[PDB]
Design an enzyme around this catalytic site. Structure first.
Site, PDB file in Angstrom:
ATOM      1  N   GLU A  36       0.793  -1.225   0.000  1.00 59.35           N
ATOM      2  CA  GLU A  36       0.000   0.000   0.000  1.00 59.35           C
ATOM      3  C   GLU A  36       0.828   1.279   0.000  1.00 59.35           C
ATOM      4  O   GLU A  36       0.297   2.338  -0.364  1.00 59.35           O
ATOM      5  CB  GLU A  36      -0.936   0.042   1.212  1.00 59.35           C
ATOM      6  CG  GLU A  36      -1.986  -1.046   1.223  1.00 59.35           C
ATOM      7  CD  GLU A  36      -3.036  -0.898   0.133  1.00 59.35           C
ATOM      8  OE1 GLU A  36      -3.097   0.149  -0.550  1.00 59.35           O
ATOM      9  OE2 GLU A  36      -3.825  -1.840  -0.039  1.00 59.35           O
ATOM     10  N   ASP A  46      -6.140   6.391  -4.943  1.00 55.32           N
ATOM     11  CA  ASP A  46      -5.656   5.014  -5.000  1.00 55.32           C
ATOM     12  C   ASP A  46      -5.766   4.483  -6.430  1.00 55.32           C
ATOM     13  O   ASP A  46      -6.051   5.232  -7.372  1.00 55.32           O
ATOM     14  CB  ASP A  46      -6.395   4.143  -3.973  1.00 55.32           C
ATOM     15  CG  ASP A  46      -7.850   3.822  -4.348  1.00 55.32           C
ATOM     16  OD1 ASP A  46      -8.333   4.147  -5.451  1.00 55.32           O
ATOM     17  OD2 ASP A  46      -8.541   3.200  -3.506  1.00 55.32           O
ATOM     18  N   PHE A  77      -8.436  -6.351   3.091  1.00 54.89           N
ATOM     19  CA  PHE A  77      -8.018  -4.957   3.235  1.00 54.89           C
ATOM     20  C   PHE A  77      -8.224  -4.190   1.931  1.00 54.89           C
ATOM     21  O   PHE A  77      -8.732  -3.059   1.934  1.00 54.89           O
ATOM     22  CB  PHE A  77      -6.547  -4.921   3.674  1.00 54.89           C
ATOM     23  CG  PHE A  77      -6.018  -3.554   4.016  1.00 54.89           C
ATOM     24  CD1 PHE A  77      -5.633  -2.660   3.021  1.00 54.89           C
ATOM     25  CD2 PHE A  77      -5.834  -3.191   5.345  1.00 54.89           C
ATOM     26  CE1 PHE A  77      -5.114  -1.410   3.349  1.00 54.89           C
ATOM     27  CE2 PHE A  77      -5.312  -1.949   5.678  1.00 54.89           C
ATOM     28  CZ  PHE A  77      -4.954  -1.054   4.675  1.00 54.89           C
TER      29      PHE A  77
HETATM   30  K   LIG Z   1      -2.077   2.654  -1.902  1.00 49.36           K
END
Ligand SMILES: [K+]
Ligand SMILES: *SC1=NC(C)(C)N(O)C1(C)C
Ligand SMILES: [Cl-]
Ligand SMILES: [Cl-]
Ligand SMILES: [Cl-]
Ligand SMILES: [Cl-]
EC number: 3.2.1.17
Length: 164
Positions: free
Chosen positions: A11, A20, A104
């Site tokens: 991430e 994102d 997640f």
């Molecule tokens: K990310």
């Protein structure tokens, strides 16, 4: 390696609001703020999550605090989901991390819909599960990350992460 180091690899860490891979406002270590296209809405979510008036910017400690909450929330989502919990319970700790990683990134409901992949994982048919997992929007849109997660399911090792 552990689930925190694994997701931190996947991430990144960014202390200002960014978009994102799906175009959604995010901050920290992959903390999704909102799917709304309104930056003001994202900033409002951020202030609520942190508990103060941010300028769209947080500290590393604050990013890590949200990250710990998000990892905890992913595990809790697995354990209260009737499709995910049996699979999780059946796995070793390395493959458990792979499942947490998926939840997640895509959320509990999304992963719980991988019915056929989940069955192959529960059956410990690792190569077949790996082939099935790649037949997915997930794999096509984030293939390098999906390849790492799938290798972790296939092998039960950290080989896709320990030399990054
Ligand atoms: K990310
Ligand atoms: S993978 C990984 N995790 C940290 C943030 C420690 N890194 O520097 C890598 C090697 C990109
Ligand atoms: Cl601001
Ligand atoms: Cl078993
Ligand atoms: Cl298949
Ligand atoms: Cl496909």
């Amino acid at each position: 390696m552990n689930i925190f180091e694994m997701l931190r690899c996947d991430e990144g860490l960014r202390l200002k609001i960014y978009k994102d891979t799906e175009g959604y406002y995010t901050i920290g270590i992959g903390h999704l703020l909102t799917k709304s296209p309104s930056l003001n809405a994202a900033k409002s979510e951020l202030d609520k999550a942190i508990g103060r008036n941010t300028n769209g910017v947080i500290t590393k400690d604050e990013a890590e605090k949200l990250f710990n909450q998000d990892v905890d929330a992913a595990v809790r989502g697995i354990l209260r989901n009737a499709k995910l919990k049996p699979v999780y319970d059946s796995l070793d700790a390395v493959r458990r991390a792979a499942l947490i990683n998926m939840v997640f990134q895509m959320g509990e409901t999304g992963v719980a819909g991988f019915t056929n992949s989940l069955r192959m994982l529960q059956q410990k048919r690792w190569d077949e599960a790996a082939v099935n997992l790649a037949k997915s929007r997930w794999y096509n849109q984030t293939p390098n990350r999906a390849k790492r997660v799938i290798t972790t399911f296939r092998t039960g090792t950290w080989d896709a992460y320990k030399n990054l």
